[model samples]
Target: TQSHYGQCGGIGYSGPTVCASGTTCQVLNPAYSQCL
Candidate 1:
């Protein structure tokens, strides 16, 4: 999972995003998401 909260899943990221080191990717806005 992601180590940071603002880590990007990918460029043109598709559905069901994945986070980094130890975090989970969650939708923060319609056009934005982040790891939590």
Candidate 2:
């Protein structure tokens, strides 16, 4: 799982979309999303 401020998902990223407890997945840009 992705931790706070970590990369969770993105346009071309094939990683986990799930964030750790207390965190949320947020889209920062078209090429990146993060656990915030």
Candidate 3:
């Protein structure tokens, strides 16, 4: 699972798509998304 400020999703990324509790998955760019 992705923790705070961790990578959660992104283009070409195949890692965990979920973030830790209370955090949100926000897209920073087409190739970058993180748990904020």
Question: TM-scores of all models?
Answer: 0.39, 0.64, 0.69
How far off is residue 26 in model 2, in Å?
A: 0.5
Q: Cα RMSD (Å) per model?
A: 4.5, 1.4, 1.3
lDDT of each: 0.60, 0.81, 0.84
Q: Write the per-residue lDDT of candidate 3 for residues 1-36, one digit (tens) a residue.
A: 789988888887776888988888888798778998
Highest lDDT scorer: 3
Candidate 1, residues 1-36, lDDT tens digits: the string is 345666555456764466676666666765566777
Tens-place lDDT digits, model 2, residues 1-36: 777888888777786778998887887788778888
Colliding pairs, model 3:
none
Of candidate 2, the 10-residue stretch with the lowest lDDT total is 8-17
Q: Worst 10-residue stretch by lDDT in candidate 1? A: 1-10
Clashing pairs in 1: 1-20, 1-21, 1-22, 2-20, 2-21
